[PDB]
Amino acid sequence: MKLSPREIEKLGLHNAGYLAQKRLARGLRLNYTEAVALIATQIMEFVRDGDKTVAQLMSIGRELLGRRQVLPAVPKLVESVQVEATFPDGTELVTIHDPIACENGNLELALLGSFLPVPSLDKFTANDEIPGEIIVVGGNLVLNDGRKAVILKVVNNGDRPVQVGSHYHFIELNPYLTFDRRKAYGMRLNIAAGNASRFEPGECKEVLLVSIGGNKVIRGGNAIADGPVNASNCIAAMQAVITRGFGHVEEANAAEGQTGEDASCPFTTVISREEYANKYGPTTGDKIRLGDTALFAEIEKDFAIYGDECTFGGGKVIRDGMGQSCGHPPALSLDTVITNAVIIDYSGIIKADIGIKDGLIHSIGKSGNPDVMDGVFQNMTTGVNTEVIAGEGLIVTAGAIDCHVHYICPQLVYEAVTSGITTLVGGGTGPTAGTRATTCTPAPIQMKLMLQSTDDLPLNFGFTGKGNCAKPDELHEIIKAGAMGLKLHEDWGTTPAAIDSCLTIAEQYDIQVNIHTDTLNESGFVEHTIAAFKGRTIHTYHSEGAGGGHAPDIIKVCGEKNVLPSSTNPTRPLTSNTIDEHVDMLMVCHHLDANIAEDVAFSASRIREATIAAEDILHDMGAISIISSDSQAMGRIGEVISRTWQTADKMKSARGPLQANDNFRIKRYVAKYTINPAIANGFSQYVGSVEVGKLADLVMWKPSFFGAKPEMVIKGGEVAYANMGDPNASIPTPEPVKMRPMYGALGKAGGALSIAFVSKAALDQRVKVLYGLNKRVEAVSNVRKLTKLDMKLNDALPAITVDPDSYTVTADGVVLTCFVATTVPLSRNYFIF
Amino acid sequence: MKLSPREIEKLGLHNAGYLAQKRLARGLRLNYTEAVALIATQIMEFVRDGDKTVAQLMSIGRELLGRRQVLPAVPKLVESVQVEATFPDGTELVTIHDPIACENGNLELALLGSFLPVPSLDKFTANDEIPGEIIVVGGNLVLNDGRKAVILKVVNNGDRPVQVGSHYHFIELNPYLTFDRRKAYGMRLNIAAGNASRFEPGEMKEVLLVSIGGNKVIRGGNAIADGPVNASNCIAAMQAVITRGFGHVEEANAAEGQTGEDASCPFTTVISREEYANKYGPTTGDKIRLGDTALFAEIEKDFAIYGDECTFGGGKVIRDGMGQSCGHPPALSLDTVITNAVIIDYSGIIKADIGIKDGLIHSIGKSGNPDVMDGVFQNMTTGVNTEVIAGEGLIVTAGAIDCHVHYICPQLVYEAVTSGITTLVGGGTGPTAGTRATTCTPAPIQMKLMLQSTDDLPLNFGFTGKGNCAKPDELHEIIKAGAMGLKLHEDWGTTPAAIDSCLTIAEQYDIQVNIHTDTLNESGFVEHTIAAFKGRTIHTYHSEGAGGGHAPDIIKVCGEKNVLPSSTNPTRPLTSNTIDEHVDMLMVCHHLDANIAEDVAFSASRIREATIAAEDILHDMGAISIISSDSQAMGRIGEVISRTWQTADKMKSARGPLQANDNFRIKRYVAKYTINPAIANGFSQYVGSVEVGKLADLVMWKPSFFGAKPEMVIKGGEVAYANMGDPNASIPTPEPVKMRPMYGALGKAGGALSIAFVSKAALDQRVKVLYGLNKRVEAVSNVRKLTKLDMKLNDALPAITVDPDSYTVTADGVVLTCFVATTVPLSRNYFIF
Ligand code: NI
Ligand code: NI
Ligand code: NI
Ligand code: NI
């Protein structure tokens, strides 16, 4: 067949269309991903037929699926569908804009060529009544306040069209525009940042101009006015205007003034507030729905000065001598700027530009060019050598950190980064019995190998040894080898003696101890394991206990001051299939028999509605500080983030507000998979939050998709993984769009962008050198003096009791009961399976 | 002063002349080295004076030192003295040939400028009555037997001199030589390999010509006769002789025959036998005095076919198409050939060419070009790409192997290679108390460091850990780190428990255990340590015991079948200062007081004339198998070799012959610092003898200096260290000549040429990769099944008793007594201090 790659991919795309076609013919309402596959698939077939032109399919594509055939969110999610195919005259791109352009679509034609029977309308469900919607405050904003202003007559005396961007130095215009060049001096158009005025030939326009800000130095254009704005350089600019024949007619009468903050001043330009949000993303006071949850994030603070937003593109702001600085010291240009980002972080929900330098977050604030703009500090310069990642309208958060990882297969890793995870911590050596049961890399040799194995992958890694030992001998060895933490697991024996010996070792080496307790209460009940901690910091895995630990009351640990507790994700939150699923999963993982009295006793003692319900609440209470996966050993790597938001969404709907928005809950929860995993494991100076001085491990989200599927994963300042369409296409957006590794994941790049975390002892020996690692290696630290109070926004310490028969949990006197949700967000709207 | 390096060196050369001047003024008869410094020094001063010419100094230099002023060896050792100095007309080279050209010299003039009083003749001792002398068998040798021959008239009709080498293809000569070219076809001159016949213009000579050998293929010269010699190529050669105007007159009458082995055949050429030895070094039956000892090596076998010796030089044998082959497959050219070497090695004293390829000894035999010489095998081809090291007249031995090394300072190392040592085995970490007492590199960290440290040094290295332990735990670790052997030392405790635990480990890891027993008999007497061996292989260091062990009878170990025993070198052999030196040395190392009864008791129990006398004998018996240094911890790195021969010289003179030459003794001893240290430590497949397949770690000796100072040290095929004179000079021989590192000692080369030995367990983990070592790393093996019978030529097992009071040693019933020698060879004749 001589299949080129693009042919192979389209076969896949087609397969997805056909599956969507089969669901449609069943009278299922299609989700976003289904609508897309189906339409791209048909477009490709119509091109194969050879009967239809591009202009035709542009129309035909709007009339396949109608409001009736799709889910309530789809008409807002599907802005359009793009695909390329081979027409009779070669490859052509077809864009279908607003494909849900009607009520009924055309079923016959949506299925045409599939040979699937065409369903009747009444086979489809009835329409129900907008993910990531921006709720704009009512009103207008005056651009560019407190600046000298002038209105000038401008003529296009050329024979061709001339168009001028918002930030072009007006004196430097095409010599064929005629106006008062002297009055234009130091001025630029008073219009929304990044648009333009178009002058057809012969046209006369009356233009509102406003003064440039900051240092008021003009660079570029025609070099008419090179230099700082002053009386002396004005005289020189005018000399050059005359000599070089730049169109000039004095307007002695021109209205002059300033942009004053009051009503009906003719120099001022206003921008409708809904429209501000659409161009540049939301600003202070606006709220943003997280994905299709019920959560709203309100912009708390904005660094933007209205009218100088950093937007990149033709005629736009980020151009030489305008928004892009020219003449500052080269070493301080930002490597990359992320423009107009909504940052959601435990430390604040804000609107800001983010500058990246040397793989690090260099600054957060208002960025651009100090020669032309007020308010640009010397650490936020967009310069010649600065790349641009456009955040307008998107959310940025820290890369997620999953601190309960089983390295069972390398593909867990791709699934992780693709969901928004950039750091993994746990143990394993591949698909062995030991690794499948416990987060342990047991032999020094295997430490060596896992570090070397994962050395090119664009994530930060930590590996943990087997902590189950009643003598320190072999623990010293595994830490010296490079383990950055130890796992105490019952399958290797978690006994008071092992617990003690392992914590004494943690005290010496400043590493975290993660524990899965003695479910069987073989050598003690939970109180005996707590006693054995002896007031020493310890991280308790899946603290609720479905995934392991003292039956039935391991959850008591969420009330010990020295315990840092996490949950794993599959019990999150309590939903209608939770219990059934987990019982059987337990039966499967423990090789138990549905028909034996005691097998079923063990399992009913392990998987308990009363405690999972309590887990939803303690999680909302900030009594459980972290959420993690338990990847392929009871939990799900790609669902750390979504299960966090699904827990938040359920609690918002069940419980009281926590402090006219959901900010306090949003920040509490984002902390559970970003900052708190980093604190617990001892590397929070390097990652876990959007703050200056930390790795620029950064995930871009569409608000409509937030918490389900991100756009782009930045690793150490460079794009590591991202949504990507047809590699052969004329743009990146045509089908099939899927998460693929990017330049940050090829060759040596993964290593240059990331950190392998080891113990200080291992680093003292330079295991980075010994092991031949190209990834940066750093030591973990500051882990032996943590208490629950060091967990950001999750420092609650209830008195917990658990009834040994009913399993009912009481916290601070209050019986904890929670309902069984029948659905969750961030699921049916997003996934093809 | 702006001193260049040469100026700095000559200052040292001067200082040596002046010291030699002071000694002469005292009426000391000078040795070789003194004579040289003195004469070069005066020559440089006479040059400074500016009064005398080169030709003058050439005569004056002969009349400074006379037979009276020098030791008996000097007139044979000092063939000449060369130096270069700045005359009024720039730098010029002065060679003084045969500087002892008279009886009285000229004292005043030998001191002139030194302002030292000129001694009178009677202050000098009276003359006494030849180191490395060759004793030639009486007679002649017929060259080139069994070959077609012809005598031809040859005339030089050219106007300039023409000279032809022994192996040039005669038909290929200058076209101005006139002779019968057709008879000359396939012939060459029948003269000694490497010389020539000179034709002045117009001269007529009657030349003996003999047929070429091997395949008889002609290549090179003028391309007259390109091809295998046969009637068809003859016809073509004659065509080209006619066409190209090569001088040709038919000699219809020429005498034709062959080289018969009878007397007075006019076609044959004989070489006087003494002359043969002088040109090509000795052959079968000749004998060579080792240095200035009484030892004589007789050549047991010669591979040469008389007349085809490989000698390289202008006009000589090793030239394109003659002895240097042209047309064989390029991959099989030797990298280097050592021509006409006497090899002295445990396995035989012989005469052979030695072929080196890929740093290994590739072949031993008759080397050359199979197209023109008989007897050249395919693995002995001197090719275009073959380097020549000329061994004619010289002795080649394996690199010495010192297996009792304390790494106290890096300089031990240079002192070792410069004396002829290429492998070191021992322990240490530098000048610490532990390393100054024991051959122990105790920490894994220090193993890594010492291997990294010594990585560029052109010697093979083995490091040994601390074997003193009653538990195996840390012993496992040091071997895994890379130790290739363990040392049990009393200073760390050599108790029966430690001995057992250590040897049990050696059985697991296949490494050698070296021991210095419990001198104090604190824990047991020697019996008890022997019992603790439990029949297991163990290397006993300084088995005599002055250097350490059970007082007074450690020597008993030389009679245990599982013991491999070595001596250190300072007690070798028993001479008049031995006992006095050692008592004090013991006092100093043990911080003892001459005035405390028990300090003097311990000392007298440790240092024992009776046992040291017995050591001379058991050494000669082949009852002690190895001689080693104990470098800087009672022993002397640069004297492993000299002390071995000094011992052999003293026993020759004291005892009966061992099997009309000294071959058996010579071989027995050479094995003590070559093959037996490599067998005992487990790397004898790589080094320790001049045998095919092993590294080309080879030392070139002048017989006159053999066992004192070597000429050249070849490390893995490349010269690593050698005598070198003035780097500014026109030749390499002018003063000051001293041992200097060569190209094998610079940059990356030392590593490329050598091996670091580790345990198999360490190599299993790739410590070579972990430690970033550029030196090749290999594992030691085949060491736990050795018995004294595996020691080459040193396998004797006497029943030994030692009287606890008289210290008298008895071996097989015989009381061992030996005299205190007053002098030793390989000392006063050679050293400047
Ligand atoms: Ni677990
Ligand atoms: Ni787990
Ligand atoms: Ni010793
Ligand atoms: Ni020693």
Side-chain angles (χ1 to χ4, degrees), chain B residues 667-725:
Chain B
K667 298 194 277 189
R668 154 161 296 169
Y669 279 76
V670 78
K672 292 161 178 320
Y673 65 77
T674 58
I675 190 66
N676 287 342
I679 287 166
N681 293 284
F683 48 70
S684 74
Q685 73 269 53
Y686 300 107
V687 296
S689 65
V690 185
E691 302 183 83
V692 180
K694 295 187 176 195
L695 266 67
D697 288 357
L698 296 168
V699 181
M700 306 291 290
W701 310 82
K702 266 190 167 146
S704 56
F705 283 85
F706 173 100
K709 314 165 158 203
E711 305 286 288
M712 189 180 286
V713 183
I714 303 155
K715 189 79 194 58
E718 157 77 8
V719 174
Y721 241 97
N723 286 334
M724 180 58 45

Side-chain angles (χ1 to χ4, degrees), chain B residues 351-402:
Chain B
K351 187 67 180 306
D353 302 309
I354 303 167
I356 294 165
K357 184 81 197 176
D358 305 325
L360 313 175
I361 301 179
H362 199 238
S363 43
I364 300 191
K366 194 275 171 293
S367 147
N369 174 7
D371 285 329
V372 300
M373 297 168 166
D374 284 17
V376 181
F377 294 125
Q378 294 289 89
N379 56 17
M380 296 256 181
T381 295
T382 305
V384 179
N385 296 344
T386 307
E387 175 65 303
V388 176
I389 295 178
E392 41 268 21
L394 300 184
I395 293 156
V396 184
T397 68
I401 302 184
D402 189 0

Side-chain angles (χ1 to χ4, degrees), chain B residues 105-124:
Chain B
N106 185 355
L107 266 340
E108 161 161 4
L109 201 137
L111 289 182
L112 166 38
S114 83
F115 301 99
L116 292 168
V118 189
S120 59
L121 259 74
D122 55 50
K123 294 174 59 190
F124 280 98

